[PDB]
Amino acid sequence: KTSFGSLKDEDRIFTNLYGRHDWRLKGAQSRGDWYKTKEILLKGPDWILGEVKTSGLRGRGGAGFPTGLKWSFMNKPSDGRPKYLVVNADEGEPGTCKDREIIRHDPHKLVEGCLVGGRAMGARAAYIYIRGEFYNEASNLQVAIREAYEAGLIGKNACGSGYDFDVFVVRGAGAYICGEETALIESIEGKQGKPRLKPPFPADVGVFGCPTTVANVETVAVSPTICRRGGAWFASFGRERNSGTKLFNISGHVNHPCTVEEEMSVPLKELIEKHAGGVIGGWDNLLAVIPGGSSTPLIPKSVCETVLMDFDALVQAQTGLGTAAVIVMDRSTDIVKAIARLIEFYKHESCGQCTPCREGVDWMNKVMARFVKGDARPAEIDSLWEISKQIEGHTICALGDGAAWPVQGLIRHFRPELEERMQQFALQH
Amino acid sequence: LQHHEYSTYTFLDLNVELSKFRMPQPSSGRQSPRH
Amino acid sequence: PSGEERCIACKLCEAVCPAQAITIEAEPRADGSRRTTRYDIDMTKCIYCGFCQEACPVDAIVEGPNFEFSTETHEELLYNKEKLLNNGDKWEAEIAANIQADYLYR
Amino acid sequence: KLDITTLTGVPEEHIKTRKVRIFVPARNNMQSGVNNTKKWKMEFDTRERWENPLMGWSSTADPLSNLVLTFSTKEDAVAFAEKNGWSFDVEERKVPKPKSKSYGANFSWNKRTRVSTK
Amino acid sequence: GALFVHRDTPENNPDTPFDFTPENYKRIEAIVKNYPEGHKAAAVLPVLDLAQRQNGWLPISAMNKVAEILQVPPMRVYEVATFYTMYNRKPVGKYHIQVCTTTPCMLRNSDSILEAIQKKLGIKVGETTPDKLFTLIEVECLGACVNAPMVQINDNYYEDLTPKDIEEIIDELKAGKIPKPGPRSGRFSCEPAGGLTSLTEPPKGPGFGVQAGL
Amino acid sequence: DTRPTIRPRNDVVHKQLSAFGQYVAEILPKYVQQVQVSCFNELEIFIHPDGVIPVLTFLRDHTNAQFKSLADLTAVDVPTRQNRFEIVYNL
Amino acid sequence: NLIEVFVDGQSVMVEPGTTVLQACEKVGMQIPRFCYHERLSVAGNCRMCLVEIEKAPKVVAACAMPVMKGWNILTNSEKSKKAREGVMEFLLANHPLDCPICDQGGECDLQDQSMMFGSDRSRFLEGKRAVEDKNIGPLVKTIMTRCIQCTRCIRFASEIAGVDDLGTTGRGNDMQVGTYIEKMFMSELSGNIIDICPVGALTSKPYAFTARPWETRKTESIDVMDAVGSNIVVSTRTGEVMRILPRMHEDINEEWISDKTR
Amino acid sequence: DAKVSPPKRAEMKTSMESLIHHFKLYTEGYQVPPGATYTAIEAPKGEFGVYL
């Protein structure tokens, strides 16, 4: 296969993505969920992990780390501490609104994924840390979990397979930093949501000081479908090392802002036009696109013209797939203002633990505000680039790196606008 | 479309219902590591 | 200009003094600021180098324009904090004018 | 034993009464640097420091009050004290014991080490 | 623009009367049961959430009481309260409107919705109405990042908002009417505006594509 | 490095001084104990104290070493060495 | 059991579990640090201990990262130098210009580490932050504007003192360190938090404004208030006892002295 | 080099780094790398050298 992005409804994992069916157990089972889960569990943890590896599933939370290997990290003889699994449901990345759809409209799919993953990693129970703002989604998830408990799908002797597994939901309290895996672990443990410093890796020491694995909602939810339909099925979609189907949260200056499940390695322009109706005012009216949430650097229209929405291709484009939250910006958009707003978001969502993040992010926000007003000098742009480089790679968590990347992208692609704005501001005074 | 029904304690009430379905928790060996 | 002593008892002018002529002892003032209880410089030991004024971070100790201050007794040369404050009050106009005329060079 | 006492010129009072202390300076608790605590040093006993009546400045008659001599090794200081005939007290260097440190222990499962806050 | 220090006040003092209702204590018991023994401190966030859900805001007495319930240091509860934004360490209005202002919503002109709210209520961002019925704040993608301007009032999501639509919602709340949570553009959920671009076909059904090995 | 802050260093003089130091050491192995050239191009020859007169006489009369001017003769007192005083001849 | 690691190309045998900073200490390299304390739990928040390991793309935190056999710790590599410079720049970005009026002046880890590893100028063209001070008792004068959020005081109070009063309030650049409520930090070992504080945020209230470190003469001595025998350093200036500081003695007082002694 | 030459007074009162260096340079002083040299100039009375 050389031309990707032709995903069929027969190949879409999330069938109730738009909530047009029954999110409850009846609808989920009617759509193929919770099917032969006992056989899946009895197949063997090694078998499940092998199926995940065959599918080539990579982290759908944004990291892109091979999911099979990451889950295999915890498939070791028990050290005496009760192994646990954590499903990341915070979804705090600006532009990312997929996990919400999965939880609110196909919660039972996620619950089955939790059961299968826990069996694959020998986890006692699963804690799904959902964002506190997602109260109604959490209510839906809890109803689904209750239905599963009553039906015997989860709990002791889950699906009549003998595996004793539990699914817990922990509501957040409004912190984007909690999206980070170790910060999520700390938040669950009751401390402030400040990320840990690896090592120790979460697989070894995690929630309650026990072997723990943190996985994205989509990453977990696709596991049962990967097992049932075979790893080859998931691998068939997408290029090698970029296989599968990724939810694309197209947002911003698009005619039809929506979330659509499309095959990986899909051309960006196609994806924008195929589902979102194209850029408002036409393709030529596009200014730039942020492919993955906000952390990933922006790509100008020139690159956006011909680029595949997959991990490797976007990495070549000085960006990343991330959460695949395509933020379309038309030419009526002050790119400086948008990037400054993202930097302000990072400033207001910084844990404050690491010195580079705590101070540098605020410094960058100040400089970005001055750039938005044009109250600066051309050398300050290079100074800002150096500040971003200093922050990146020198922080405990990747929030600092994911805040340096937008500034770097803005400079690297639209430095002329910054310089021209400074010139205009100088002329005014 | 049942999100409108969910009230303030809905999530907490469902967790209370789930308590019976849950199974015994593990123990660290201490009331609190502070102990 | 308000009238508060610029000296905030950092004592770095005491350290920099190459002749060890400045003796500074400070205690928290009733208000709570760093105000010296002793600022003694024996002019009979000072070499009039000017390192003290270059070191002071608040432009408190500044060598004035008066070169004609010869005394008849050795004790007079040893200047107390009160003597320094009075000298500042006397020569302030000229000292401020000279600093205003030279601060750009410094 | 080299006897340079006659050639030093030090007054006899400050040859016998003096009590040299050979030691490695301790680390200032305020700072964390250890560069100062790397060479042996020799100091003399502290004596009377009265107040000058005129100004209040501290006055002393001890000529060796400010003498501090650094030495590479303790043996060097001992030999130098012996040459000059000064009674010397040697304090053995105290090196902090190596301490096992684990960041993971901060998040222990069943240990007191688990930190309450970060 | 908020203080992370506490000064004892008549409304917020250690003697301020707060206590969970008995049913709330039962809920707390269930919550603590969720977490493993020896790690009951993990319940600080949900128990504080229950305290806020009951009292409306979190007085210092609430934090002290939660610390007592979970046998945790009070300072840790204070840290948790300050760190997370959802906790209302100061009294808030009945309807705490939260208008997202991040880049995605800004591109969709969420500032218009914010201005409409300010004009209708007559209060600026961060202020509370004289009737103490409405409060205004800013947020990030609450899951409506692909759903146009969105505000979160209490625990309700209102997406695809328009200035007039937001005025309608505010008026409904002001008249003691609960508006329908969800997109107000007529779209259902996050479906493509111009018809379903995917999932047009009905669900395949159980047993579809099942691997032969199983 | 470069730029005005760093002091420019001339390697040619360094090489010349190192070669001449080896020359002196070879001519006078009886006394020369160590030869060093500083990074700021200052050749230093360490000589056993018995060789004060021979080494200096060689460095003064030899055709290829015409150091006929005693710039400065000083001493450095290092109390941590058995031979505390270090006599330094600048030529 | 000892694994063979290399520091700047110099082989050194270390027990498994040794942190990179400890191996560098073994070879004689004191990596700059603000948050790491030998007697306090590893934190890793200051980010000043960042060092480069050969054949490694990202600099590691020497204070926390445990060594692995074969690692060559490039303590004085360009990556390490630039990391230290950047972190110091971030630390000093919001730090108030209080050196002339800061009692820590002349003995400030921030000052010396900036002078030895940091740059010589600033690019911060913005406005600095100011934090309201918090009273924690009649012994420790607190100026939280100078705090660098090293969390040493919090860890010390939590583990050595055993009084869980100090903590961080807020998040981001607005994160303030101190009790959320107006509470006095009462402990028999509270005074040591003055010493642990790398910057002059916490200063001895009696010793405040009295004298500078360079002038004070130090005399090692033994405490007599209690029968512990804590070793103390009597800092005397002009024949007057100015302050009493702990002397390191692992067997008796380690690095702490009682408040009475101090 | 603000670690050798004291910063300008205006910079010292504005930059945090400058104030630190201004404090240290005037209290401690710049540390000279270990070594020795004999630098001599053609002073008016003859060769004036310093063995530092």
Ligand SMILES: Cc1cc2nc3c(=O)[nH]c(=O)nc-3n(C[C@H](O)[C@H](O)[C@H](O)COP(=O)(O)O)c2cc1C
């Ligand atoms: C600042 C920050 C925010 C993050 N937010 C999220 C999030 O909202 N959802 C998510 O799944 N992962 C988020 N992550 C990534 C997590 O740390 C973790 O890698 C991820 O949840 C695991 O995804 P995977 O197992 O599918 O690879 C965030 C990471 C950082 C540094």
Ligand code: SF4
């Ligand atoms: S780059 Fe950060 S001061 Fe951070 S562990 Fe952080 S939200 Fe952080």
Ligand code: SF4
């Ligand atoms: S005169 Fe200036 S330098 Fe001297 S102590 Fe006062 S402020 Fe410091």
Ligand code: SF4
């Ligand atoms: S000018 Fe006078 S007081 Fe100042 S340093 Fe020179 S000798 Fe000392």
Ligand code: SF4
């Ligand atoms: S803590 Fe150190 S750097 Fe900060 S003002 Fe005080 S002396 Fe200066």
Ligand code: SF4
């Ligand atoms: S007050 Fe001092 S010890 Fe406490 S966190 Fe701040 S700098 Fe560290």
Ligand code: FES
């Ligand atoms: S940025 Fe406002 S809802 Fe996403």
Ligand code: FES
């Ligand atoms: S000392 Fe290493 S990060 Fe603090």
